[PDB]
């Protein structure tokens, strides 16, 4: 168990991380939706940590934005086991070549704190492939199928991180009011969503006046938030946006919450990435040429790649049933934060600019 303090330090740098990984991605990517957990990654680098020495784990530290005087996987392992389960389902594994023997003293802390020791690669392609898609498969709980998608041999420390999210709203939507309707992928040009529908929801929803941003959180069940960010007008990028952010835009509004129409796309957004590009440039390319991780094995160990995967779905799923109102719909381009409420800490982050990729734009009268 970690204080009050330790716990507030951790949401602070997981804000840092997460504001500095999400600017990067957005900016090097070119795909249409963007969805990071940037709390996994963290939580995979944390089981680099716990086997990284000197610099690399000095490094390691500086990225996270963490404290050196905390314990990197302490911290993120027991923050995310306290989560409650049945909604984040999370896979993160270290595999190694044949040749790489391992420390006990890094079999046993990886068993305590990540639930599972690192593998040894059998070294043949094949194999290796589907042994890890199964157990992948097997650690989201049927959720994340046929993660990889390729394997070199040309291959040291595989560090691979998927994860999966589905919640349960406080209060659900009544999927018989679901209906095709209009998001607008800019003034012109729209696309047909399931939009979910509520005729008299209960939610903190409030401006940010000059940048021109609505902002709206949907609570989860257990301990959770969906939270909407939406600029009124579409020539954004997701940098600018961040930069008129605050915490109590993010975190415990004291707004109360008052009765609006509401209309919320369903969504499934799925992103795999390599991030070996963007951890370098973010300060730690060292770990991809010659990093210190003597923890791990004493000689002589390189990261190959740093394969990570987000999938989130938004659906009608939730616990509580129960002068006009006013509308908020959520049918122009938008950023979402998945906040984890208790101690302010980012658990997934994303951009949609059309909800639906596979839907044959129209060009509205």
């Given at each position: 168990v970690p204080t009050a303090e330790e716990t507030r330090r951790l949401a602070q740098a997981m804000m840092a991380f997460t504001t500095d990984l999400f600017s990067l991605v957005a900016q090097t990517s070119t795909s249409s939706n963007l969805v990071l957990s940037p709390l996994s990654v963290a939580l995979a680098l944390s089981h680099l940590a716990l086997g990284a020495q000197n610099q690399t784990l000095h490094s390691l530290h500086r990225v996270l934005h963490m404290?050196?005087?905390?314990?990197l996987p302490h911290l993120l392992s027991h923050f995310y086991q306290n989560l409650?389960?049945?909604?984040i389902r999370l896979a993160a594994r270290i595999y190694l070549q044949k040749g790489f023997p391992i420390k006990d003293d890094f079999l046993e802390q990886s068993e305590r704190l990540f639930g599972a020791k690192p593998v040894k690669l059998t070294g043949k392609q094949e194999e290796d492939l589907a042994n890890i898609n199964q157990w992948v498969k097997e650690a989201t709980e049927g959720k994340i199928?046929?993660?990889?998608s390729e394997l070199p041999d040309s291959t040291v420390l595989l560090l691979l991180n998927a994860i999966h999210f589905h919640g349960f709203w406080r209060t659900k939507f009544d999927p018989s009011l679901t209906q095709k309707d209009f998001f607008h992928l800019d003034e012109r040009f729209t696309v047909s969503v399931d939009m979910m529908h509520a005729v008299s929801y209960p939610l903190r929803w409030f401006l940010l006046e000059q940048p021109e941003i609505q902002v709206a959180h949907f609570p989860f069940k257990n301990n959770m938030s969906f939270v909407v960010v939406m600029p009124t007008y579409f020539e954004w990028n997701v940098s600018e946006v961040l930069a008129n952010l605050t915490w109590d835009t993010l975190y415990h509004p004291s707004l109360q919450e008052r009765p609006t129409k509401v209309w919320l796309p369903k969504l499934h957004l799925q992103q795999q990435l390599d991030l070996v590009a963007t951890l370098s440039q973010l300060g730690l390319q060292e770990l991809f040429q010659g990093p210190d991780l003597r923890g791990i094995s004493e000689q002589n160990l390189v990261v190959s790649s740093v394969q990570h995967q987000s999938t989130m779905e938004l659906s009608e799923a939730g616990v509580e049933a129960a002068m006009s109102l006013s509308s908020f719909t959520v049918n122009r381009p938008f950023l979402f934060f998945i906040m984890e409420d208790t101690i302010g800490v980012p658990l997934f982050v994303g951009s949609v600019r059309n909800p639906n990729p596979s839907a044959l734009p129209q060009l509205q009268e």
């Open positions: 404290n050196t005087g905390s314990c409650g389960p049945g909604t199928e046929d993660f990889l």
